[PDB]
Design a protein. Structure first.
Lengths: 244, 241
């Protein structure tokens, strides 16, 4: 696992700095009405055998949320998880799954992928959802289940959570997460599923505005974890446990 | 499951119930050096396909010293009050294997999932397996069985236990109102837990010593041997789908 070095962190920072201006956070000619399928992608990994991992890509119909495509792949991960560097951990499995989907079911290719974690909501504005979106020329949305703290942007977990609870007291369900250093919205803390109090954090990935991203995440919501994410995570994990 | 099979099972339980020993004899808490666990994981995709697991942990340190899993073919479905006939054969198999491989690790008592004396015919799976194998067993159930014929109702017991908790207690006697006898003990031994588990005497051990041993096996809500047996059985089952 000896991939993370000071020099590797420097290289990763550099690549992120050159990519960040390529991330598009607007819809262009894309709209919610064009979404017929939504994709998911995830990676499960073994703690017993560190090399052993399984990627999974799914496609669900929109808005019915019915799974129409699934594939898992035994993969060897190139670097461990390090916050702010998830992209370098899952870019290759993603590209491989995507290429397989395009060769197998090109007409099921989704108009947008939901990816675990952040997109624009990132210290260098280049989270994994955005990174994978730009490197594959695919529309992506970032959906994170926990909040990343960014001191350099004035984003603190306790403050965001307390602001969101104060919002809930008024009946709201969406809260803009803001960088005080750049005076911009990074993400949206949202609560769409019933019987849920813990928000999830949606950020624009690539080729999609934050607003359209949130609408798509709402349309994908049955429970707290949107369906494409739920399915990719489930099948990747199950296959990993089978071969572990 | 047919009427005749139910009749045969009732008859076997009626014949076994009087062989159950609910006293310690020459056994005491100070003799427990190892505690056994055992469980079976089923697949809902494939009904015959199952995996048994037997574990042995040191006492009171709760350190796992033995584990084994076995692919099993189930003989009958689950039907409440008849759990024993579903797992008697896998248990015996694991037990014999343990005795053959590590005879010096044979435990003085097994914790078994479900009830012992706390049963319509006073012969739950823990007692049944204990007597048919001449081993000391304790019944540990994670949910409450209702026995209307003994006056045991879930809402009443749960409400009684919550009223007890509001006073700081952690043990509630479960009694038959028709036979005027103690059936089980609703207990709370783990910290940060409010949901009781239900301990009944299995075989060759009193209910009071049983509860003492269950307390000794408690780190979290599910006592360690049960937790471990379920853990390994489930993992191995997931390996074979
Ligand atoms: K495959
Ligand atoms: K976490
Ligand atoms: K965390």
């Amino acid at each position: 696992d000896n991939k993370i070095t000071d020099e590797q962190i420097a290289e990763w920072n550099s690549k992120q700095e050159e990519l960040r201006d390529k991330i598009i956070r607007s819809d262009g000619d894309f709209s919610l009405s064009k979404v017929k399928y939504v994709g998911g992608f995830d990676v499960s990994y073994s703690k017993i055998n560190h090399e052993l991992a399984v990627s999974c890509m799914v496609v669900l119909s929109y808005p019915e949320m019915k799974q129409v495509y699934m594939n898992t792949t035994k993969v060897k991960l190139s670097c461990p998880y390090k916050s702010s560097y998830l992209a370098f951990r899952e870019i290759e499995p993603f590209q491989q799954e995507l290429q397989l989907l395009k060769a197998k079911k090109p007409n099921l290719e989704p108009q947008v992928f939901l990816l675990d974690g952040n997109g624009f909501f990132h210290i260098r504005r280049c989270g994994a959802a955005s990174h994978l979106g730009v490197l594959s020329n695919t529309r992506t949305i970032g959906v994170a289940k926990s909040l990343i703290e960014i001191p350099e942007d004035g984003v603190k977990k306790t403050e965001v959570i307390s602001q969101f609870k104060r919002l809930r007291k008024t009946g709201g369900n969406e809260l803009d997460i803001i960088s005080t250093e750049k005076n911009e919205v990074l993400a949206k803390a949202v609560l769409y599923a019933p019987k849920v109090e813990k928000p999830i954090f949606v950020s624009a990935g690539h080729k999609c505005s934050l607003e359209t991203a949130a609408k798509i995440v709402k349309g994908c919501t049955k429970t707290r974890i949107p369906e494409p994410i739920k399915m990719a995570n489930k099948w990747s994990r199950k296959e990993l446990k089978k071969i572990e």
